[PDB]
Amino acid sequence: DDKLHSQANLMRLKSDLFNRSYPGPTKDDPLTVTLGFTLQDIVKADSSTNEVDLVYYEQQRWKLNSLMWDPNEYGNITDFRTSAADIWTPDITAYSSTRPVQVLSPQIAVVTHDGSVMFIPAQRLSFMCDPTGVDSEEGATCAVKFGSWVYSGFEIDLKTDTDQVDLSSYYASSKYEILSATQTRQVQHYSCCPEPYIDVNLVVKFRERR
Amino acid sequence: DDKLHSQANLMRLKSDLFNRSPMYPGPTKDDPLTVTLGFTLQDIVKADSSTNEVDLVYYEQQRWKLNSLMWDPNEYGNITDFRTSAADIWTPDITAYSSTRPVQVLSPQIAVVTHDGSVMFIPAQRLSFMCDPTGVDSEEGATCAVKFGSWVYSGFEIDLKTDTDQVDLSSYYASSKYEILSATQTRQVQHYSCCPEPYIDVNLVVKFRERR
Amino acid sequence: DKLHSQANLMRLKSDLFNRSPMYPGPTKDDPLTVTLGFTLQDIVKADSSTNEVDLVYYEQQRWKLNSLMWDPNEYGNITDFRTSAADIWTPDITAYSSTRPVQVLSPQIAVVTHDGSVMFIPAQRLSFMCDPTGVDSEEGATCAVKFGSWVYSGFEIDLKTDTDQVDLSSYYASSKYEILSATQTRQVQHYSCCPEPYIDVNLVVKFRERR
Amino acid sequence: DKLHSQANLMRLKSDLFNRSPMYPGPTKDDPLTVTLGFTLQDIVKADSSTNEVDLVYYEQQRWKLNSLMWDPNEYGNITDFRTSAADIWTPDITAYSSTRPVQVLSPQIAVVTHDGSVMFIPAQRLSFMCDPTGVDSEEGATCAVKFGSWVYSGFEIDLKTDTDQVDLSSYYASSKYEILSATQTRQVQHYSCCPEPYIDVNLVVKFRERRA
Amino acid sequence: DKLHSQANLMRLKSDLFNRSPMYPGPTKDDPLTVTLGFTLQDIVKADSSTNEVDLVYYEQQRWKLNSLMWDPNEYGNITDFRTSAADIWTPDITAYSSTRPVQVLSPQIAVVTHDGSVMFIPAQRLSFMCDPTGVDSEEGATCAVKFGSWVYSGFEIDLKTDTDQVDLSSYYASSKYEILSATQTRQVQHYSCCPEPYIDVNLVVKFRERR
Ligand SMILES: *[C@@H]1O[C@H](CO)[C@@H](O)[C@H](O)[C@H]1NC(C)=O
Ligand SMILES: *[C@@H]1O[C@H](CO)[C@@H](O)[C@H](O)[C@H]1NC(C)=O
Ligand SMILES: NCCCCC(=O)c1cccnc1
Ligand SMILES: NCCCCC(=O)c1cccnc1
Ligand SMILES: c1cncc(C2=NCCCC2)c1
Ligand SMILES: c1cncc(C2=NCCCC2)c1
């Protein structure tokens, strides 16, 4: 009865936000995405092509007024899960991938009654890295920047919560140990366009384990 | 003729369950769900010590139960269950937590739904995950482990469960390159710094060595 | 004229799928016989570092639904047609010991005849569990893989073979591996847990390095 | 003027697709002639450990349907148009001895002309069964692969070649293998599957390693 | 206010996509000019065993349609919008000597501007026919690959470059190969068979092993 209600309520909530009622951010309605990285593994550094492969996940966070509901209208539901395909999601792309990104996790996001969204895709990424000096104590340094591919800083702004990449889940028996890992926001201009584009540069210092 | 009668019943039941109500939204804290997991290990195919990746083929038995999938067989010609495509129904988002490649489905994706509302789903899969196979060529063998759990639901929404903690090795390829010394599956609760909700996984530990 | 036969087809095809209720698959009450047969074209690869062997073959499948029947006279003497394999029901026949997902090498089109039978012959490359030790000896290597329904018992889908000899008439003459024998044997088994028989077809292949 | 030329095409295409019975394919009552021709671009790779060879080539397919005829005058003198291959019926021409799925290198777009003829030219990378022995000799290696309909017999699809010579006028001049000769020839054949004969176009390629 | 912009952009796309039948593509009578430009990011791999070289670049494509024009005054001063590439017409620009299907590295969203212009910048990994002989010398290797429409001629689609100098400003400083020169050149092709011309852009890159 009451469970059939919660189920009934939640079914209703979704139907109101999705099926009854977002073309993306505009310059009069810009959006801020908070990015954060949890590096899990450096699986492979290839010195013959200069490609390194990382497994990691990407915390993405944003807020949309058109996803706001009063819990009192809906049996006091505070949040729900939904297929990422049921909502709009940012096009956060790596700028120096050498291969299509591979998805290791379900495409499900959590929507909270204030309109805030959290999406945490796990992925394997091949990207441009010269791993020379990885077999030394100084290690090798590599970098890759992530941003929206089609939206300028007038439509999508990026930010971090910490400038420190989360290394708490890093694979303890990886071939590569992590010396340091930062995530830093940047504003850049490219020659196609007059407008700034925003990225978050992920810099990693790593070396062989011993 | 009587056969055409029983198809009618099954058709009628499947259209009643699937086309009648807005489909199940997934579990909530008000309406939690217990999912039982079990692993049957077929083969360790590859152990790469240059990247520290290992590849498993296995069956992942998932069963759970919904009150929206219940029916009285007295109203549907004594039908007690049916096979259906896994895309027709809600399924749990049980994910490996330390995979390195996308998981490859080796089998059809067909569930069995029973009149009490229980669903059983057993996909066969190839998984690559993080495994330092150091010790595999020794007699004491190598030991790797991988956790499985919901990717987006906490312990307040999805509770995991096992029926046993012993992993089924009765179908393990007899001529695998690796023999299995032991395989276990064990439920675990952990809290995380970000969040006061508890979180639940089934850690799958495997010891193996080069078969010789 | 030829335009009418064109039109009876999209009627016949409308009558069968769109208009009627969907086939829910076989039941214990309405079992289905599926006839299975393999044409082996090539053993492409045998990897003794992972114990995986790669085969390329065609798999002939045949079954019959009363729900796919029509009177030719009622549709302009159309006795059969072609249709996309996804527009109809197909049996969930699977290799039980593959290591990679099957790769389809042929179009997914079946032929449906007026008596209600279906023929469907996908070409595939399969990687399955096989120790090739002895493949470089005169006596060779032996590998075996079973096929059968993943979720249907013998009381719902009855597997069958026309013959227990695999067709080697299209086997690649200049392959790396020479075929000594290739059988496809039907097996029926019972399990203490369960009241129904479980059927599968065991593809057993004896082969060696050619020369 | 541009809106005008645009309106005629949108109208021409709409009459053909949206307002008409789709063509289901050839019958014995209404057989179809598909014509094939190959343009070999490259032999990328020859693997003598598996006996697989990799080719890059585009395959010219043409056929004619009354279903697709139109008077150019009723349509602003439009004599042809380009359209997505999914909007129309295409033949199921298949390599008979591929060892991998075919990889498509070009847009899936065909050209339709007012007499109803259709020209579809897909570029492909094919892996197929080929023993490259003798490729390091002056006489070279020889391989062969048949292309034909997978589900239609020689009474439903009649396969032809405008010519027996494969077009080698775009063959990569700095390829690892030079072509000694390449033919495309219609054969008729039987299969145990089915009572009726099937038609294919056999592509026999003769090639060796390039040396200066 | 922000709800208005959302609504304004929605009505715009509604009026642009639904009032009229999508652009059916260019014709002899309504030809389109497409501008191309390459930003070469990295030569990742030069295989001398297969003579294939792998590039990663992004390819700027630009065109203008009268049917994508609007007055920003009528639409909340929206000067441009982002939209999925499946919602509009895009050109079939293909690499003519690819050995592998192109791998897409960027989202497939275009930017439509109020004057009717479209900018679409797909980032790709391309494998193509190239003899890397000389890459370990001082003179280096040279490779070439043409880009153009697969199905249109110069009568329907014309190509253009803004410059003939490939943008090397995002080239990977620690790549295995250093770029000696990179050009992008519009070319016209005349064939005995055919009155229509054919336009391509010819990407020529000179490079060598980095020291
Ligand atoms: C179920 O089977 C029992 C025993 O054969 C029979 O009496 C009963 O009528 C059946 N009920 C239905 C609804 O078919
Ligand atoms: C409209 O938006 C454009 C684009 O940024 C801006 O430059 C211009 O000033 C705006 N016009 C008005 C009247 O605000
Ligand atoms: N009964 C539904 C799933 C069964 C899947 C399975 O483990 C299996 C394995 C081997 C043969 N048949 C079935
Ligand atoms: N209809 C297909 C034309 C494309 C073939 C082509 O232009 C070509 C020819 C030679 C080298 N590179 C490309
Ligand atoms: C518009 C359309 N597609 C890509 C971009 C760009 N985005 C990222 C790099 C700068 C150029 C802009
Ligand atoms: C019917 C269905 N599927 C494939 C075929 C055949 N076509 C190719 C090989 C010969 C038989 C017939």
Q: What CA–CA distance (Å, rounded) separates E47 from A121?
A: 34
- Ligand nearest to C-alpha E189: 4
Nearest by Cα to D183 from D33, D35, D40, D34: D40
Report which secondary-structure segment, H or E, holds C198. Answer: strand C198-209
Residues of chain B with Cβ-Cβ distance to A41 below 8 Å are: 98, 100, 130
Report DSSP letters for A116-163, one per residue.
Answer: EEEE--EEEEEEE---TTTTSSS-EEEEEEEEESS--TTTEEEE-S-S
Phi then psi dihedrals of residue C7, to 5 deg: -80, -35
Question: In this structure, which residue's CA is closest to atom 14 in ligand 1?
Answer: B77
Ligand 1 atom at minimum distance from B76 CA: 13
Residue B22, Cβ density class (10 Å: 0-12 exposed, 13-18 middle, ≥19 buried)? middle
Burial class of residue C193 in the structure, from the number of CB atoms within 10 Å of its CB (0-12 exposed, 13-18 middle, 19+ buried): exposed
- CA–CA separation, E52 vs E129, rounded Å? 5
Q: How many angstroms away from the CA of E24 is the closest CA of chain D?
A: 6
Question: How does DSSP assign D152-182, residue by residue?
Answer: --TTTEEEEES-SB-B-TT--TT-SEEEEEE
Q: Residue D87's closest CA among D8, D3, D7, D15? A: D15
Contact A180, A140 (CB under 8 A): no
Of all ligands present, the nearest one to the C-alpha of A28 is 2
The structure tokens listed for A33 are: 């995405």
Helix (H, G, I), strand (E, B) or coil at D34: strand
Round to whole Å and give the CA distance between B152 and B97: 12
End-to-end CA distance of chain A: 60
CA distance B24 to B34: 15
Neighbours of E195 (CB within 10 A): 8
From residue E113, give the alpha-carbon distance in Å to each of C199, E12, E73, E81.
63, 12, 14, 7
Per-residue tokens: B111: 């569930």
What is the spatial distance between Cα A11 and Cα A3, in angstroms, rounded to a whole number? Answer: 12
DSSP state of D108: -
Q: Which ligand is nearest to the CA of E107?
A: 5
Chain E residues close to D49, C-beta within 8 Å: none
What the block records as the tokens of D103 is 């990889």
Instruction: Give the separation between CA C113 and CA C126, rounded to whole angstroms.
Output: 29
In B, which residues are within 8 Å of C50 by CB distance?
A: 45-46, 177
Please compute Rg for chain C using Cα positions. Answer: 20
- Put simply, the answer to whether B52 touches A43 (Cβ < 8 Å) is yes
- 8 Å CB contact between C209 and C178: yes
Q: Regarding beta strands B33-48 and B110-114, do their DSSP bridges make them parallel or antiparallel, or are they unpaired?
A: unpaired
| Contact list, E100 vs chain D (CB under 8 Å) | 103, 105, 125
C156 is in an annotated binding site: yes
Confirm if A63 and A116 have CB atoms less than 8 A apart. yes
What is the end-to-end Cα distance of chain C in Å, rounded?
A: 59
> What's the gap in Å between E97 CA and the centre of ligand 4?
8
Gap from CA of D170 to ligand 4 centroid (Å): 7
Q: Which residues contact B42 (CB under 8 A, 6 or more apart)?
A: B57, B58, B59, B124, B171, B172, B173, C97, C129
Breaks in chain D listed by the residue before each, with C–N > 2.5 Å: none
Residue B73 beta carbon below 6 angstroms from any ligand 1 atom? no
On whether the CB atoms of residues A41 and A54 are closer than 8 A, the answer is yes
* Calpha distance B139→B211 (Å, rounded): 10
Q: Which residues of A touch E (CB under 8 A)?
A: 22-24, 26-29, 48-51, 65-66, 91, 93, 96-100, 128-130, 132, 149-151, 155, 190-192
- Listed residue (D156, D5, D158) closest to D79, CA to CA: D5
In this structure, are residues E38 and E184 in contact, taking their beta carbons and an 8 Å threshold? Answer: yes
CB atoms within 10 A of CB B157: 19
| Rounded distance between C-alpha atoms, residue B112 and residue B86, angstroms | 9
Structure tokens that stand for E72 in this block = 């920003």
> Is E153 annotated as contributing to ligand binding?
yes
Residue D204: both structure tokens together: 């026999």
Closest alpha carbon to D158 in D206, D70, D93, D203 = D93
**Residue A105 and residue A57 in contact, taking contact as beta carbons nearer than 8 Å:** yes
State phi, psi for A93 to the nearest 5 degrees.
Answer: -115, 145
Distance between CA atoms of A160 and A60, rounded to whole angstroms?
Answer: 10
With 0-12 / 13-18 / 19 or more C-beta atoms within 10 angstroms meaning exposed / middle / buried, residue C2 is: exposed
Are the C-beta atoms of residues E128 and E50 closer than 8 Å to each other?
Answer: no
| Residues from chain E contacting residue D163 (CB–CB below 8 Å) | none
Residue D126's H or E segment, with its range, is: strand D123-129
- State the Cα–Cα distance between residues E1 and A173, nearest whole angstrom: 53
Contact by Cβ (8 Å): D36, D120: no
Ligand 3 centroid to Cα of residue C83, in Å, is: 29
Domain boundaries defined on chain A? 1-210
Question: In a 10 Å sphere around its CB, with 0-12 CB exposed, 13-18 middle and 19+ buried, how is residue C18 labelled?
Answer: exposed
**Choosing among C171, C172, C177, C210, which should be mutated to test the D contact, i.e. which has the most D CBs within 10 A?**
C172
Q: How far apart are CA E148 and CA B189, in angstroms?
A: 58
Q: Both tokens of residue D49? A: 């450990």
Q: How many helices (H) and strands (E) does chain C have?
A: 1, 12
| Per-residue 3-state assignment (H helix, E strand, C coil) for chain E | CHHHHHHHHHHHHHHHHHCCCCCCCCCCCCCEEEEEEEEEEEEEEEECCCCEEEEEEEEEEEEEEEEEECCHHHHCCCCEEEEECCCCCCCCEEECCECCCCEECCCCEEEEECEEEEEECCEEEEEEECCCCCCCCCCCEEEEEEEEECCCCCCCEEEEECCCECECCCCCCCCCEEEEEEEEEEEEEEECCEEEEEEEEEEEEEEEECC
* CA–centroid distance for E88 within its chain: 15
CA distance D123 to E95: 11
Structure tokens at A21: 């009622």
Pick from B6, B43, B45: CB nearest C27: B6
Residue among C5, C3, C2, C20 nearest C75 (CA):
C5
Q: How far is E107 from chain D (nearest CA, A)?
A: 19
The encoded tokens of residue B76 equal 């549907």
Q: How far is CA A72 from CA A20, A113, B185, B189, in A?
A: 19, 11, 42, 32
Distance of CA D66 to CAs C4, D22, E47, Å? Answer: 14, 12, 49
**Is B99 within 8 Å of A104 when comparing Cβ atoms?**
yes
**Residue D114 is assigned to a ligand binding site:** no
Q: How far is C180 from chain B (nearest CA, A)?
A: 21
Return d(Cα C50, Cα C33) in angstroms, integer.
36
What homologous superfamily is domain C1-211 in, according to CATH? Answer: Neurotransmitter-gated ion-channel ligand-binding domain (2.70.170.10)
For residue C30, say whether it is annotated as part of any ligand binding site: no
Contact E5, A28 (CB under 8 A): yes
Cβ proximity of C121 and C59 under 8 Å: yes
Which chain B residues touch A175 with a CB distance below 8 Å?
50-52
Q: Please state, in angstroms and as integers, the Cα–Cα distance from residue A22 to each residue in C6, C187, E117, E170, following that order.
A: 45, 58, 23, 33
Q: Which residues lie closer than 8 Å to E64 by C-beta, 6 or more apart? A: E32, E33, E115, E116, E117, E118
Mutate to test the pocket of ligand 1, among B71, B76, B78, B79 (most ligand atoms within 8 A of CB): B78
CB–CB contact A43 B26 (8 Å): no
CB D185 within 8 A of CB D161: yes
| Contact present, E108 and E82 (Cβ < 8 Å) | no
Whole-number Å distance between alpha carbons of A198 and D193: 61
Q: What is the largest CA-CA distance in chain B?
A: 65
- What residue type is B39 in one-letter code? F
**Token output for A155:** 């439509």
What residues of E are in contact with residue A29 (Cβ under 8 Å)? 2, 5-6
Nearest alpha-carbon partner for A181 in A203, A208, A159 = A203
CA distance E60 to E90: 12
Helix (H, G, I), strand (E, B) or coil at C121: coil
CA distances from residue C63 to C25, C30, C148, D7 in whole angstroms, order as listed: 12, 13, 14, 49
Question: Which residue is listed with tokens 């990104």?
Answer: A101
Q: If you ran DSSP here, which 8-state letter would residue C139 be given?
A: S
Q: How far is the CA of E140 from the centre of ligand 4 (A)?
A: 26
Tokens 């997902």 correspond to: C101
Backbone angles phi, psi at D6, to 5 degrees: -65, -40
3-state secondary structure at position A5:
helix
Query: By C-alpha distance, which of A199, A209, A170, A188 is closest to A38?
Result: A170
User: Residue C47: what residue type?
Assistant: D
Token pair in block for residue D67: 């279903």
C-alpha C7/C-alpha D23 separation (Å) is 9
- Beta-sheet strands, E only, within B50-177: 53-65, 81-85, 94-96, 104-105, 110-114, 118-121, 124-130, 142-150, 158-161
Q: Determine whether the interchain pair C99/B45 forms a contact, defined as Cβ–Cβ distance below 8 Å.
A: yes
CA distance B131 to B205: 11
Q: Which residue, judged by its Cα, is nearest atom 8 of ligand 2?
A: E77
How far, in Å, from the CA of E77 to the mean position of ligand 2?
6
SS3 C183: strand
Helical H segments across chain B, by residue range:
2-19
Distances (CA, A) of B179 to B53, C15, C27, C143, C144: 17, 56, 39, 19, 19
DSSP code for C26? -
Cα dihedral: D186, D191, D194, D197 (round 10) = 30
Burial of A60 by CB count in 10 Å (0-12 exposed, 13-18 middle, 19+ buried)?
A: buried
Which residue, A143, A154, A168, A162, is CA-closest to A198? Answer: A154
Query: Would you say the C-alpha torsion B107, B108, B113, B119 has a positive or negative sign?
Result: positive
Whether B79 and B7 have beta carbons less than 8 Å apart is answered as no
The token pair at E119 is: 């900018």
Question: CATH for A1-210, among 2.70.170.10, 3.30.365.10, 3.40.50.720, 3.40.50.1370?
Answer: 2.70.170.10
* Ligand positioned closest to the Cα atom of D60: 4
Q: What residues are paired with E105 via a beta bridge?
A: none
Question: What's the CATH architecture for B1-212?
Answer: Distorted Sandwich (2.70)
Residue D208: both structure tokens together: 């060796």
Which residue's C-alpha comes closest to atom 13 of ligand 2?
A: E77
Chain A residues whose CB is inside 8 A of the E106 CB are 93, 149
Q: Report residues whose beta carbon is within 6 angstroms of any ligand 4 atom.
A: D 58, 121, 170; E 96-97, 146, 150
The Cα E191–Cα A84 span in angstroms is 50
Rg, C-alpha atoms of chain E: 20
| D80-84 and D109-113 strand pairing | antiparallel
Identity of residue C29: D
The one-letter amino acid code at B119 reads V
Q: Which of A96, A146, A149 to mutate to test the pocket of ligand 5 (most atoms within 8 A of CB)?
A: A149
Q: Whose CA is closest to B54, among B131, B148, B168?
A: B131
Token pair listed for A130 = 């010269």
Residue E179 backbone class (left: φ over 0; alpha: ψ -120 to 50; beta: rest): beta
**Hey, what amino acid is at C123?**
A
Tell me the CA distances in angstroms from C39 to A81, B106, C169, D143, D201, one per residue in order. Answer: 48, 22, 8, 21, 21
Strand, coil or helix: B182: strand
The dihedral region occupied by C116, where left means phi > 0, alpha psi between -120 and 50, and beta the remainder, is left
Q: Quick check: do E and C touch, 3+ CB pairs under 8 A?
A: no
Interatomic CA distance for residues E83 and E118, integer angstroms:
10
Q: How far is D100 from chain E (nearest CA, A)?
A: 13
Enter the DSSP assignment of B85.
E
Nearest partner of E59 among E43, E82, E39, judged by Cα: E39
Alpha-carbon gap, residue E132 to E49, rounded angstroms: 10
Amino acid at A186: Q
Residue E79 Cα to ligand 2 middle (Å): 8
| Residue D139 burial by Cβ neighbours in a 10 Å radius (0-12, 13-18, 19+) | exposed
Residue A80 in contact with residue A16, Cβ under 8 Å? no
Q: If DSSP codes are grouped into helix, strand and coil, which group holds residue C9? A: helix
CA distance A115 to A67: 4
Q: Are strands D103-104 and D123-129 parallel, antiparallel or unpaired?
A: antiparallel
Backbone angles phi, psi at E134, to 5 degrees: 100, -5
Per-residue tokens: E156: 């329907």
Of E44, E78, E103, which is closest to A100 when you measure between CB atoms? E103
Q: Do C6 and D24 touch (CB under 8 A)?
A: yes
Ligand closest to the CA atom of residue C167: 6
Structure-token match 């527009």, residue found: C87
- Integer Cα distance of C7 and C13 in angstroms: 10
Q: Is E13 exposed, middle or buried (0-12, 13-18, 19+ CB in 10 A)?
A: middle
Closest CA to C60 of C124, C154, C130, C145: C124
Identify the contact set of chain D against chain E, taking CB-CB distances under 8 A.
Answer: 1-3, 5-6, 9-10, 13-14, 41-42, 44-45, 56, 76, 78, 81-82, 103-107, 109-111, 121, 123, 125, 172, 174-176
The Cα C185–Cα A136 span in angstroms is 59
Whole-number Å distance between alpha carbons of E141 and E152: 32
How many beta-carbon pairs below 8 A join chains A and B? 77
Q: DSSP secondary structure string, B66-78?
A: -GGG---GGGTTT
